[PDB]
Design a protein that fits this description.
- The two termini are about 20 Å apart.
- This protein folds into 2 domains: about 110 residues, Translation factors (Elongation Factor Tu (Ef-tu), domain 3), CATH 2.40.30.10; about 150 residues, 3-Layer(aba) Sandwich (Rossmann fold), CATH 3.40.50.
- The protein has about 260 residues and is an alpha/beta fold.
- About 15% of the residues lie in helices and about 15% in strands.
- A 3-stranded antiparallel sheet has the order 1-2-3, with no helix packed on it. Strands 4-5-6 form a 3-stranded antiparallel sheet, with no helix packed on it. It has a 3-stranded parallel sheet with strand order 7-8-10.
- Bound molecules: flavin-adenine dinucleotide (FAD).
- The site of flavin-adenine dinucleotide has 23 residues, from strand 3, helix 1 and helix 2.
- Nitrate reductase is a key enzyme involved in the first step of nitrate assimilation in plants, fungi and bacteria.
- This is Nitrate reductase [NADH] 1.
- Belongs to the nitrate reductase family.
Length: about 260
């Protein structure tokens, strides 16, 4: 359903990493979007209305505003299409004060009470989870995580996330995890993997490269019957290294391999 939010404010978290403050129309209510869903930000562009799915990441309690951290897809910086992209750039260029158009809640995943999941029709109850994200696919997962640890200490579920990302500096929500899953052990299991390691001198101890069975062995639990997987990332980073090795890792692919 539409809404008339607005660019209340902008905080470009780094190089090409935005932090958008689109407030609500009526600041007394929430962008009440069920944990398992996302908005379809409508910004009429070119001859289309570039409806791009997005899950803000901030707190559900937060009244009258919803936060979106973006990874802007700039120009003259990338082969195959040097250009970047109409919409994200457009969301950058877009100056504050300008009213946007939101659209919750268009999804399939959704977290019921403590532990269980409702899902595309059915619903499946899971104790320990598998969170092999990828890129800025952290947020739609964060949507589950934070909630799971807020509903604590009674939810007390297990999450073995695998923040798949491309480089050391490109670990978006580092701390919001790397602060969290320290004070909360048994609860969440963080893991960070990276192709390029900019500063060996910082001292890297997490994975170096991309998702492979060995990474998917220690950092991920057994599937069998009872464990769900909540993946998120570039399709190839799914066809060859999330679906195959996990297809072999005695887990269920059809019945529960979820993406968003
Ligand atoms: C539900 C959901 C939630 C999402 N949440 C977020 C979120 O928190 N943050 C966020 O930033 N996005 C999010 N995405 C949004 C979505 O994929 C967008 O298309 C994304 O924001 C890029 O939009 P754009 O207009 O630039 O995309 P498009 O116009 O579709 O073009 C971007 C495409 O071309 C490629 N591309 C272009 N330039 C580059 C480049 N510089 N480097 C690498 N690849 C390039 C990309 O691989 C990408 O898929 C999410 C996606 C989904 C499904």
């Amino acid at each position: 359903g539409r809404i008339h939010c607005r660019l209340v404010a902008k905080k470009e978290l780094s190089r090409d990493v935005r932090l958008f403050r689109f407030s609500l129309p009526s600041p007394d209510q929430v962008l009440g979007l069920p944990i398992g869903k996302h908005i379809f930000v409508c910004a009429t562009i070119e001859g289309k209305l570039c409806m791009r799915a997005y899950t803000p990441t901030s707190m559900v309690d937060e009244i009258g505003h919803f936060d979106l951290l973006v990874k802007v897809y700039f120009k003259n910086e990338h082969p195959k299409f040097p250009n970047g992209g109409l919409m994200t750039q457009y969301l950058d260029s877009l100056p504050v004060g300008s009213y946007i158009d939101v659209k919750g809640p268009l999804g399939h995943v959704e977290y019921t009470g403590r532990g269980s999941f409702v899902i595309n029709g059915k619903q499946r109850n899971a104790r320990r989870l598998a969170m092999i994200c990828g890129g800025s696919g952290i947020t739609p997962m964060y949507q589950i995580i934070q909630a799971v640890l807020r509903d604590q200490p009674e939810d007390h579920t297990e999450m073995h996330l695998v923040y798949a990302n491309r480089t050391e500096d490109d670990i978006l929500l580092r701390d919001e995890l790397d602060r969290w899953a320290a004070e909360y052990p048994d609860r969440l299991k963080v893991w960070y993997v990276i192709d390029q390691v900019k500063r060996p001198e910082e001292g890297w101890k997490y994975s170096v490269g991309f998702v492979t069975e060995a990474v998917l062995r220690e950092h991920v639990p057994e599937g069998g019957d009872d464990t769900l997987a909540l993946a998120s990332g570039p399709p190839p980073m799914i066809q060859f290294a999330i679906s195959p090795n996990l297809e072999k890792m005695k887990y269920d692919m059809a019945n529960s391999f979820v993406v968003f």
